[PDB]
Amino acid sequence: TVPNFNPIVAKPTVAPLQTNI
Amino acid sequence: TVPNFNPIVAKPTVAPLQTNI
Amino acid sequence: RSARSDVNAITVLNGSDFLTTVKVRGSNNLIDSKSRILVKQPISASSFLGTRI
Amino acid sequence: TTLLNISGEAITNDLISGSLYLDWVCGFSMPQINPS
Amino acid sequence: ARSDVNAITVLNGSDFLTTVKVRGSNNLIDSKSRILVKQPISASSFLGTRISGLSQFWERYRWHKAAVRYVPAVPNTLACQLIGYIDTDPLDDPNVILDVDQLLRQATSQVGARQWNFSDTTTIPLIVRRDDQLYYTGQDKENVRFSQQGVFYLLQVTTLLNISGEAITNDLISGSLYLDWVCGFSMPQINPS
Amino acid sequence: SGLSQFWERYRWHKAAVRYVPAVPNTLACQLIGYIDTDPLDDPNVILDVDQLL
Amino acid sequence: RSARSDVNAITVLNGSDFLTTVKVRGSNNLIDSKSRILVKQPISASSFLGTRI
Amino acid sequence: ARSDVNAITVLNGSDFLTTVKVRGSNNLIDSKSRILVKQPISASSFLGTRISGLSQFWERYRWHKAAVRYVPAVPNTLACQLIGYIDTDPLDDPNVILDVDQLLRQATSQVGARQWNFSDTTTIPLIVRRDDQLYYTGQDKENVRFSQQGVFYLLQVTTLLNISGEAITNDLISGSLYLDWVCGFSMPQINPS
Amino acid sequence: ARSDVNAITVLNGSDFLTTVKVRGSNNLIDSKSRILVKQPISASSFLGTRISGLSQFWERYRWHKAAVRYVPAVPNTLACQLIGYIDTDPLDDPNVILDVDQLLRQATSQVGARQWNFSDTTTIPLIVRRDDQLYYTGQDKENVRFSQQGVFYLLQVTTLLNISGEAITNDLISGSLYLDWVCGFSMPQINPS
Ligand SMILES: [Ca+2]
Ligand SMILES: [Ca+2]
Ligand SMILES: [Ca+2]
Ligand SMILES: [Ca+2]
Ligand SMILES: [Ca+2]
Ligand SMILES: [Ca+2]
Ligand SMILES: [Ca+2]
Ligand SMILES: [Ca+2]
Ligand SMILES: [Ca+2]
């Protein structure tokens, strides 16, 4: 039960147009 | 130590395409 | 004698890997049914050459 | 479906779209060494 | 003022490495064409930078916590994935590999690897070894495992495409690489040049 | 800069330039912003681009 | 992003294996010093092809 | 790895300055001829050295403990009294002095001045100010008191004479100067060149 | 009596290296001519010595406190400035340098470098690295950074000159070098020869 053998992680990030300030 | 002499504030706002309902 | 253990144990281990890329076939090549099959990858443990699994 | 762009036009380049990962868990049973 | 001591001068900084150039369609015809960068991460691998200039004035070094940082010079409407990793073995060479998926898999297999789109930014860390080893600064010599602590490979996973389905063919620049580093050099000297 | 004239000396205790973009993410260009604490370092003498960067 | 763990861990594991056979050279072939060297086997982990280590 | 703080990276070393040359009889015909060495002690005054190299990679500096060392390259059979002082004000120039003994006096009066024969070795210390001021590491610019923390002046007091009370005229080379320093640099950067 | 453990047998000694020879005027016609001694400091570099003998009976070594000593064999009436540094990287070779003062600078910059006249005696220390690395004791093989912990370089800075400002040309013998060391050997064995 070798833990964390080939772990991979996913994390999204939205890319909107015209980020306004 | 005159407080709040020339204060400025920034606040973003994302502008995504096709905001769906 | 030098006998080797007669114990059959289930060695379970977990991890991720990378199968392959997907290639959508496009209007030119997409003229048949088989043309719409983009990936045929077995899931046998020994079907992923580069991986360490 | 057909591969199409912003417009309702189909593309003809036969491009690549992404990748596939396998998040797996396997139990092996009998130690050995397979030949090759 | 004539102290004969050898002390590690751990000091930080940041440096501009290179403008990367995703390959496109014309030049990208095989697998090794997808290796955009093959850049050693030895202190003295970047001539005009500050890290290399300092390195020149010491024998040894050891990245205590280094990191490569990609800053995109493109918009988000363009799309192309990239995989970046740092093999701690300067000799392990994937250029010999013919299958692209094999190369991307032996990349993702490395521990400190990352994947990302050339329109956003990330950070490619360097995973330092465990045997307290130091490395030399001079120009790479007979062997490389004496000098290089790692080698940064930057890969092209997808095809370069734009707003429309148009497949770009001109091998244009996508971003810029930056090294946010921390290392300690041990023995004062001057390396020839 | 008008109050400045009413005193004879100054020292920034905390200064930070802040960039306010006006373009969308459909354009791209890398920038470098550093504040050099020696007014006599003029990059215009530098001919090499990568050296400047 | 799909980032791969930045954790360097020492995976220690133990077991036995089989190096090779020994061939004593005998009076005919034993006519030199090198003739008395029966085994030159590195102990590198990757010097035992058939083994699983 | 990407810290923005500024710390003092104090580090030691030694460096080679130049070879000294006593002036002799024919060339020594005035008071300014007795000034053999006018050598600033700014970190960036010796190009091929380690001190100037390092200096190029910082904005400010401060000698914590410096010392100019003289190493003779001549036998004991020759004699010539020298004086070595490091003036903490570079604009102070003795070349404008016409009286020779006045020059020797304003030299000896420096708190870190040393006198010795050109066949002996001795250490010329640098004396550091009390206000904590930091100096700049680049080439000398509109003013000199920002960069140069000191200026090493070497004097020929007596005439070069052989075994007897007989003078020499060939203007032979006496020895070389070395710098044994420990300095504290403040702001990481790269200076132009 | 038949223990299998491995311990560090640190032991002291002194040994004779070779006789130095200043180059003179006629032979000194370039920058590589000023390199009088290129002598590795590997324990097994001096055949008839005690250090190399002992080395032959161990696999690994590490200088704990070494020092090269110069003993003049000439009078005070002669003068020649030398520089002695022990480079901890053997592949660093100054013979490829053409500029002489650059060579003197890269020498002086070594943290354990000493300068002196060939009529005086002085000690050239060895400086030991910080990573605990051990070196090998056998003859030099495919690579040199495994065996040699250092390399002693002796320089002729000025020209050999007599009482006056007059040069010499006969290329006379100046003195001899000695090694005062204490080393720690690790693995008992006998090396081939
Ligand atoms: Ca590797
Ligand atoms: Ca070196
Ligand atoms: Ca600056
Ligand atoms: Ca003064
Ligand atoms: Ca002040
Ligand atoms: Ca400056
Ligand atoms: Ca060196
Ligand atoms: Ca080690
Ligand atoms: Ca050996």
Coordinates of C-alpha atoms in Angstrom, one line a residue, chain A:
Chain A
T1 CA 0.0 0.0 0.0
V2 CA 2.9 2.3 -0.9
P3 CA 1.1 5.7 -0.4
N4 CA 1.6 8.7 -2.7
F5 CA 3.2 6.6 -5.5
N6 CA 2.4 8.9 -8.5
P7 CA 0.0 11.5 -7.2
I8 CA -1.2 14.3 -9.4
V9 CA -3.4 17.3 -8.6
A10 CA -5.7 19.5 -10.7
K11 CA -6.7 23.1 -9.9
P12 CA -8.7 25.3 -12.3
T13 CA -8.4 29.1 -12.9
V14 CA -11.0 31.0 -14.8
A15 CA -9.7 33.4 -17.5
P16 CA -12.3 36.1 -18.0
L17 CA -12.0 39.0 -20.5
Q18 CA -11.7 42.6 -19.3
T19 CA -11.0 42.3 -15.6
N20 CA -12.1 45.7 -14.5
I21 CA -10.9 48.0 -11.7

